[PDB]
Design a binder for this molecule. Structure first.
Ligand SMILES: *[C@@H]1O[C@H](CO)[C@@H](O)[C@H](O)[C@H]1NC(C)=O
Lengths: 213, 50
């Protein structure tokens, strides 16, 4: 809205990373103090620094807050193993008659190497045919990272309806697994000759097909 | 001290203006500031709008 933030910022583990926050002349440039918060994906945000002059208890001294007139800046020294969150600007807005937050910056560069994926295609069982639906599942497991595109074909034309893709989650041995469903009906399931799922990972494309008859 | 008949040019006539107008525009622009007073609700005295 009234506060704009960059989408992402790049840095190195050992140099200085500085973020710039720009607003208006009635919320931050009027004279109001600014507050910075960290939005960890899964935990409630906490207070980092208020007023850019005092240090709250439990907060390290590596975080520095300054207000260069209409713009506020935050600087850090060294990238540790907990900076994988979002930084926001909080200031009182007279026009909005309340507190308004910023956009949010993501702090990550690269932590995902490559691996070799493996897929499995399982046709629906006999009890699924009488439910007036056909859920075609093509599971993908043991791959890294979790960025796989899913394409469905019926050996004559690609299927662009009912295609879904779930987000992958970390396995026990630091890998990723995913599944893809396809909503169909048993009326046309038997008419088609075969069904398959096609995926591509870093140029490696594998294909598995099943025959209902 | 003796002037004969004829035409004679003595000085020059200059019409000095008495008033000056220097107004360049007809009106100047404005900025949105009436919303400070024309508002649905106001703030309090411990935390007022700046
Ligand atoms: C506020 O609203 C009134 C009526 O809508 C209008 O006459 C006036 O010019 C506006 N601005 C101020 C500063 O009062």
């Amino acid at each position: 809205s009234v506060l704009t933030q960059p989408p992402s910022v790049s840095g190195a583990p050992g140099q200085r990373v500085t973020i710039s926050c720009t607003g208006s002349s009635s919320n931050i440039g009027a004279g109001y103090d600014v507050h910075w918060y960290q939005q960890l994906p899964g935990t409630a945000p906490k207070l980092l620094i208020y007023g850019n002059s005092n240090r709250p208890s439990g907060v390290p001294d590596r975080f520095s807050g300054s207000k260069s007139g209409t713009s506020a800046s935050l600087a850090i020294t060294g990238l540790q193993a907990e900076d994988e969150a979002d930084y926001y600007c909080q200031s009182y807005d007279s026009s909005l008659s309340g507190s308004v937050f910023g956009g949010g910056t993501k702090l990550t560069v690269l932590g995902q190497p490559k691996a070799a994926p493996s897929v499995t295609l399982f046709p629906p069982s006999s009890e699924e045919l009488q439910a007036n639906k056909a859920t075609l599942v093509c599971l993908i497991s043991d791959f890294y990272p979790g960025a796989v595109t899913v394409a469905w074909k019926a050996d004559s034309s690609p299927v662009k309806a009912g295609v879904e893709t779930t987000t992958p989650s970390k396995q026990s041995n630091n890998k990723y697994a995913a599944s893809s469903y396809l909503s169909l009906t048993p009326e046309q399931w038997k008419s088609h000759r075969s069904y398959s799922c096609q995926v591509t990972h870093e140029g490696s494309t594998v294909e598995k097909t099943v025959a209902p008859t | 001290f003796t002037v004969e008949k004829g035409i004679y040019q003595t000085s020059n006539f200059r019409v000095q203006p008495t008033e000056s107008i220097v107004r360049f525009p007809n009106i100047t622009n404005l900025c949105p500031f009436g919303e400070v007073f024309n508002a649905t609700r106001f703030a309090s005295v411990y935390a007022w709008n700046r």
